[PDB]
């Protein structure tokens, strides 16, 4: 005959969802920078993350129904909101701005003079600041302005003790949960994954905030991947990941100086001081050769994805907000946008210098469209410079000529470009098996 015999500790996993904690690196424990935004209480990372490779195994992966990216998005939202709660509120900044220009001769730099409550509530002071044109809106004697989000939200100044640099972060599944790594070279997001391996903590992706492209990412695939639930769907965002990192040199020449302005008792807001030196503008420099070669690689894969070889025109963003139309990112503590139209203007049918992109700075920002909560980014002293290397593109196909345009806006796609190869599975160590064994009475 035959008899059942259950085994405890069986290698069985099933698709499931659970709250995943974090484990950040301890090298930042000597660079707290007063509780940096990304990591405050994250536990130290594992010194030797054991990525056990598995053989004779295959798991059905899905990066679009994946809930890891949803947890990432909600967690980043909650963390950003929590790091913004204790800082200085800027409700007294709503005031009639008697504002003029700064350019003496032939906007983007508005010298705004306004009133503000000093430390003593009885007394009131007259102070001035240099706001950007994108930061103020005209109300209809010189032209009086007011902050762009004064009538639709409450402006909160990010207290400058914290910094916005994307710290290498990790999502580690709890005990009894395994994270599967789709380590195979040729993977697109859906279908069986031949090389699947388990790991305790995630590969590690900086929480970068970006729109048109994907700064500081990682793609082991030698070719660009065209990842979308339906390439046939034109509206579907055709997520792209450049195989080769494209070095970008966005520099903010303006010598902005932080100017603390008292807005009440125990209340002070950091205004913008005189821009020392010539009045200039932020600009991003992309090597034309590198961008052309990477565009060649992406267009090759796009032609392979869409038919075999078809006319493909890289066009500028069809539409969106400032963040969507103009690629957005944080260089050295402040957020600014570049139209990136010199990057998407190549009409390709079958087959040294740097392209310079105009960049506009917008200090007051309400990113993630959380209406009712807008942040005021303080000025950062000195020239701001940061160098990154693009790894991904958020392209969207238009409705023999298939024209691609940048998209984005939705921030789930930012995380999906890196959590594409991971998934979470729970362990069910109980398993029934037939065995000739037989216990004694």
């Amino acid at each position, epitope marked *: 005959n035959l008899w059942v015999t259950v085994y405890y500790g069986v290698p069985v996993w099933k698709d499931a969802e659970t709250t995943l904690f974090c484990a950040s690196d301890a090298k930042a424990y000597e660079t707290e920078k007063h509780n940096v935004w990304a990591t405050h209480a994250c536990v130290p990372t594992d010194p030797n993350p054991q990525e056990i490779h598995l053989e004779n195994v295959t798991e059905e992966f899905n990066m679009w129904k994946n809930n890891m990216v949803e947890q990432m998005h909600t967690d980043i939202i909650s963390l950003w909101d929590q790091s913004l709660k204790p800082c200085v509120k800027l409700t007294p900044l709503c005031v009639t701005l008697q504002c003029t220009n700064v350019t003496n001769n032939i906007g983007e730099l508005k010298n705004c003079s306004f009133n503000m409550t000093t430390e003593l509530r009885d007394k009131k002071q007259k102070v001035y600041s240099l706001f950007y044109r994108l930061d103020v809106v005209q109300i209809n004697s010189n032209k009086e302005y007011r902050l762009i989000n004064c009538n*639709t939200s409450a402006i909160t100044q990010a207290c400058p003790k914290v910094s916005f640099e994307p710290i290498p972060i990790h999502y580690c599944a709890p005990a009894g949960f395994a994270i599967l790594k789709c380590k195979d070279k040729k993977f697109n997001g859906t279908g069986p994954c031949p090389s699947v391996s388990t790991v305790q903590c995630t590969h590690g992706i900086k929480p970068v905030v970006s729109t048109q492209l994907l700064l500081n990412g990682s793609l082991a695939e030698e070719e660009v991947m065209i990842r979308s639930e339906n390439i046939t769907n*034109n*509206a579907k965002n055709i997520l792209v990941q450049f195989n080769t990192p494209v070095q970008i040199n966005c520099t903010r020449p303006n010598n902005n100086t932080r100017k603390s302005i008292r807005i009440g008792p125990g209340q002070a807001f950091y205004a913008t001081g005189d821009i020392i030196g010539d009045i200039r503008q932020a600009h991003c420099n992309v090597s034309k050769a590198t961008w052309n070669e990477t565009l060649g690689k992406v267009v090759k894969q796009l032609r392979k994805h869409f038919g075999n070889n078809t006319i493909i025109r890289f066009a500028n963003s069809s539409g*969106g907000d400032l963040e*969507v139309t103009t690629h957005s990112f944080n260089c050295g503590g402040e957020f600014f946008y570049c139209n990136t139209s010199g990057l998407f203007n190549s009409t390709w049918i079958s087959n040294n210098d740097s392209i310079t992109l105009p960049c506009r700075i917008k200090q007051i920002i309400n990113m993630w469209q959380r209406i009712g909560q807008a942040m005021y980014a303080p000025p950062i002293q000195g020239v701001i410079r940061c160098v990154s290397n693009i790894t991904g593109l958020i392209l969207t196909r238009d409705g023999t000529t298939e024209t691609f345009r940048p998209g984005g806006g939705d921030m789930r796609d930012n995380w999906r470009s890196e959590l594409y190869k991971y998934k979470v599975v729970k362990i069910e160590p109980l398993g029934v098996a037939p065995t000739r064994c037989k216990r004694r009475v």
Partner: antibody
Amino acid sequence: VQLVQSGAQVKKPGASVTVSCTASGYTFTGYHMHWVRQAPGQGLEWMGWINPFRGAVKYAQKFRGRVSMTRDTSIEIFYMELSRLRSDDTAVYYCAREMFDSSADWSPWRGMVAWGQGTLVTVSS
Amino acid sequence: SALTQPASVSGSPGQSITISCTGSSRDVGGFDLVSWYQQHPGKAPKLMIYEVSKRPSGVSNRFSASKSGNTASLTISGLQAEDEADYYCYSYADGVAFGGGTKLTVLG
């Protein structure tokens, strides 16, 4: 779910016509918003769809370079602007709201059940 | 219109008739996003079916719609007086596409 549209407008060819279409009765930033133009006596035509979240848009190949459509989350108003008018542009325009939220499998190309009253524009020489 | 609909149809109340939205292999045969709007006299077209054969609430069972390969079809059952409306077939041909619309008449 109800959508008020702007009143009738009279325009000259070569000018620019902009129309409004408010939103009420649902969450504003969770449903794509098609724009549909119907010429009097002809077939039904499409202009574009707006994603109110981040303001993502996508136009029609026949209308690329002329149409420009935006929105404001504050007042929940859908703005459709059409420039470089022609004789055939004389029509009544409709704004269509989807059935399902923007997160559905085929959300931006679903039935667009909710339709506004409609605004008619007269572009005559 | 890429969705080839016949010019017009006529009939009487009570019986059941059909209308077809014949398309190519890329609009209706390639994709299952078929639909059937109903334009009202000088008013907005309201779809009666929303997929290959899906209908939302707010429409009687007399509208049976399905796709016969490359030729999608709609059936008007138990014709009545209020059925005096033109019906537009809708499909996603790598983008929105509207049919030519068919005139329909009862007892007239």
